[PDB]
């Protein structure tokens, strides 16, 4: 990976002098401007593409390791502001997760006494960023400053309207609520944090605004204790047609672009995104598997796709795609699967049509209707003719007497008949048709089948044919199945 | 496809005593819709002792309530049974049942001093 280092041998000897400059012994007051130096530089190696990364903090390490860092706390008692304003957008770029921790240790206080100070707008960006990756150091650090101001501003900044300033308004309060765990999210709604992000998810100016503010409602949807407070802030409402709306390859095209979100995330903020796919809300999951999908399609135009297998992420979407009733959740999955190059799982369902008696039998000992199985093996049923029992041959010849027996008993049957495997005899694939409709009405394809029709032949039938040929008694069943076979009129 | 299962475990367990049993399948186990576990008793016929359902829902015979658990691990491809209280009656050869058709061999568990 000589690459790697041949852009430090790039970047690094520029810090020589650089590093010398602002520790210029003199200074001058208008010699402070000297700040600049380092910034473009950092900048500048930030965006090499596919190996932007592995220089950044490679970079950035420099001032912390042999001594940098201590100036940008040094030089913030200057009493006027353009030097603060200078200095802080400097000390955005250099905060990895190996920086935080000398911040965390000595230099809260540094950062809130200028968080106060929430008028200037040329300086608010700054503030806001700061405070944005301050989240990601620890639970305790959160509860430090969100017992001081520390939410308060950002939660104030919703009133403004610079549009970077809000950029990091939504990722700040991302972080908080994905880094904060579980305590600091009812204090959250209790400062009354989730109503305020509405006029962010309402922005019909930037895409990122309401992508990050659907980011940070689901996240705390998933406070149980405080869930109805937030459903009734009116975002939610917001999140479900929005990533219906967009898709995740133009999202991936517009993070390339900009500088700040160019290269992507680190493992430590994805896998902290994993969890929100098996997770009880619907928007939860379509959120996480939107930015999951995009991620992936963001670090799969460089060769980095092997960060996904060691994070634990492609298991949870590949067991989280077969046997998912969610069409646009189950879409995002596969999308990224195929994209990442791996097999989607199909299920493995039993084929019943070709049951014979013992099959038969063992399923009568399974779904607990073990009294039975001499009977159905002296009038010797198969998977043919358990698929085609009415309820007169349970109620004479099987012996099946009372009704609710009978009752008890159907409902399993059509709980197996739902999950078969029909491929065998199902040539036009009229289960899949059945299934799109609504998954309830896939148990209708083998009395399709049995008396033969099919997708091409299904549009000449009629109500009274459905009924007592095809088995169908549900009224609604047949209306609907009617209703989406007649639209297609003498299509073909 | 073919799925082909191995199960391990068993032996001899005094009265009143804990067992753990194995289930190794070819393929991944949230693939696949239904498993279950079955006693066979010498001198009698099958009958089954718990499934698990691809959701995560389990189901016993009255007879078994609270003396076994079944659980489903997909770090790696196995289904579990516990037996925690053993009575002398609970005495057969097991076998693990994937789908309703696929089988497996059995192993033998006695239980007695």
């Known amino acids: 990976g000589t690459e790697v280092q041949d852009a430090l041998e790039r970047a690094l000897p520029e810090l020589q002098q650089a590093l010398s400059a602002l520790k210029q012994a003199g200074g001058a007051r208008a010699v402070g401007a000297g700040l600049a130096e380092v910034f473009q530089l950092v900048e500048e190696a930030w965006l090499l593409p596919a190996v932007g990364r592995e220089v950044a903090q490679g970079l950035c390490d420099a001032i912390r390791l042999d001594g940098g860092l201590d100036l940008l706390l040094r030089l913030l008692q200057a009493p006027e502001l353009e030097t603060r304003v200078q200095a802080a957008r400097l000390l955005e770029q250099i905060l990895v997760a190996e920086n935080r921790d000398r911040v965390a240790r000595i230099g809260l206080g540094v950062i809130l006494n200028l968080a106060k100070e929430r008028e200037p707008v040329e300086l608010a960006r700054s503030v806001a960023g700061i405070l944005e990756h301050m989240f990601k150091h620890s639970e305790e650090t959160c509860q430090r400053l969100v017992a001081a101001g520390g939410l308060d501003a950002v939660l104030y900044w919703c009133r403004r309207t610079d549009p970077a300033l809000l950029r990091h308004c939504a990722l700040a309060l991302g972080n908080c609520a994905l880094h904060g765990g579980q305590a600091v999210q009812r204090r959250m709604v209790e400062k009354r944090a989730a109503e305020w992000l509405f006029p962010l998810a309402f922005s019909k100016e930037d895409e990122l605004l309401r992508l990050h503010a659907c980011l940070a409602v689901a996240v705390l949807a998933t406070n149980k204790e405080v869930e109805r407070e937030v459903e009734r802030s009116g975002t939610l409402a917001l999140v479900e047609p929005l990533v219906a709306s967009l898709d995740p390859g133009r999202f991936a095209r517009c993070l390339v672009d900009a500088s700040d979100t160019s290269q992507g995330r680190g493992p430590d903020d994805l896998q902290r995104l994993v969890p929100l796919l098996d997770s009880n809300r619907l928007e939860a999951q379509c959120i996480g598997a939107f930015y999951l999908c995009a991620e992936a399609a963001i670090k799969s135009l460089q060769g980095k796709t092997k960060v996904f297998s060691d994070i634990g992420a492609i298991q949870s979407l590949k067991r989280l795609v077969s046997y998912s009733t969610n069409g646009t959740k189950s879409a995002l999955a596969k999308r990224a699967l195929r994209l990442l190059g791996e097999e989607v799982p199909r299920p493995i369902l039993p084929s019943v049509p070709s049951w014979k008696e013992a099959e038969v039998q063992t399923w009568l000992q399974q779904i607990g209707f073990s009294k039975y199985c001499e009977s159905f093996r002296e009038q010797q049923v198969d998977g043919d003719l358990l698929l085609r029992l009415t309820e007169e041959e349970l109620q004479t010849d099987l012996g099946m007497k009372s009704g609710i027996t009978r009752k008890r008993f159907f409902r399993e049957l059509t709980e197996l008949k739902t999950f078969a495997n029909y491929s065998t005899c199902d040539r036009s694939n009229l289960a899949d048709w059945l299934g799109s409709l609504d998954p309830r009405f896939r148990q209708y394809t083998y009395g399709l089948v049995s008396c033969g029709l099919d997708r091409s032949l299904l549009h000449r039938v009629s109500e009274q044919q459905l009924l007592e040929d095809c088995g169908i008694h549900l009224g609604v069943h047949r209306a609907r199945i009617l209703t989406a076979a007649r639209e297609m009129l003498h299509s073909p | 496809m073919a799925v082909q299962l191995v199960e391990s475990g068993g032996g001899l367990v005094q009265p009143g005593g804990s067992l753990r049993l194995s289930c190794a399948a070819s393929?991944?186990?949230?693939?696949?819709?239904?498993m279950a576990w079955y006693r066979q008793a010498p001198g009698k016929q099958r009958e089954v002792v718990a499934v698990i359902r691809y959701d995560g829902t389990t189901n016993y015979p009255d007879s078994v309530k609270g003396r076994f658990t079944i659980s489903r691990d997909n770090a790696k491809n196995t289904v579990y049974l516990q037996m925690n209280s053993l009575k002398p009656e609970d005495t057969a050869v097991y076998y693990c049942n994937a789908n309703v058709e696929t089988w497996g061999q059995g192993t033998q568990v006695t239980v007695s001093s």
């Open positions: 393929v991944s186990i949230s693939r696949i819709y239904v």
